[model samples]
Target: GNVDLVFLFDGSMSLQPDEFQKILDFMKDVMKKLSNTSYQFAAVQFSTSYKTEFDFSDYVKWKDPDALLKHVKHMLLLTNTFGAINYVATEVFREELGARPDATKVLIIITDGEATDSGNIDAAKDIIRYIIGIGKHFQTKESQETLHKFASKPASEFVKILDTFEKLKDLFTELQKKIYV
Candidate 1:
């Protein structure tokens, strides 16, 4: 099955400019590999604010790679995970691509740190439900707590959220592969 992905990046101040750039490079490299895999990619860059660094249609249409790279390169890391995820959930997902047919909507969030706003995890839960619907499969206290902790702590606490990502990776990968199969 073909896949459509939303790559959400946490561009908060805690991420050094170099580290942010490294993330872009890593994504570009991965995109190169996924180019042949029937995958389409959209990007969201978030900090205290969020923006569609790239839109769903761009990937669906397979627009110029150089143009995409340039857009990605110019995006400065400026938002925290809370605001970014909220932007993706409340604004981008709701407004931009919410009505598209089910095509394996995977929100791949890459953050070097935790959130920086109030009620971050609560917002994330809403976003997950908006994108994937409410269910036992999507519900987890770990997810809830991670969001809350990120919102409550300093950006440096992101390292602790690595465990959350590990669990998320396992779940998302299994679910996505099942969708593909």
Candidate 2:
């Protein structure tokens, strides 16, 4: 089954503007490799608010790798992480993508700092619950438990990209394969 991926970029002030560009470059590279797949992707950038940078449906039109790279170049680095994640999970995913059948929805949060809003993790948990409720595939006690566990963990714990890209890539690649295959 194909998957619906929401890429959440951290626009927090903590990350330098150049660093944010690097993140976009990394994303462009990854997306190029994944362009041929049946996966649907949405790009969301967050600083003080969550903004939909691009939609999966729209991306289909810009199949050219150079266009995609240019598209990434225009992305601005905003400043709010917590609010953006909450907005994407609750408003975007829950309202728009949740109802689709044959969609494995995933929230890929790329943050280099802790959540700005103290309740970000809690909001993320609620978003996960909402997703599970609307998607029967996620309707399981184990799934609920896993969501709860994730919510309980510190936000900093999720900020692991600075430590190792190889490990992160390996883990994400494995997850992506599982979801897309």
For each candidate in turn, give its C-alpha RMSD to the true structure in angstroms: 8.7, 9.1
| Model 2 regions lying over 4 Å from their true place | 64-79, 94-99, 120-159, 164-181
lDDT of each: 0.53, 0.54
State the lDDT at 151 in candidate 1: 32
Q: Name model 1 segments beyond 4 Å from true.
A: 63-65, 72-79, 94-99, 120-181
Q: Compared with the true structure, what per-residue lDDT tens digits does model 1 show for residues 1-181? A: 6556667766666555665675565456556556666666778876766778777676656654446757554344453665566666555554355325555545666664434555444554522221211123225555444544433234243222333323343445454444332
Question: For model 1, how big is the CA root-mean-square deviation?
Answer: 8.7
Query: Tens digit of lDDT per residue, candidate 2, span 43-88?
Result: 7777666777776655667765456445443334444555666677
TM-score of candidate 2 versus the correct structure, residues matched by position: 0.62
Q: Give the best candidate by lDDT.
A: 2
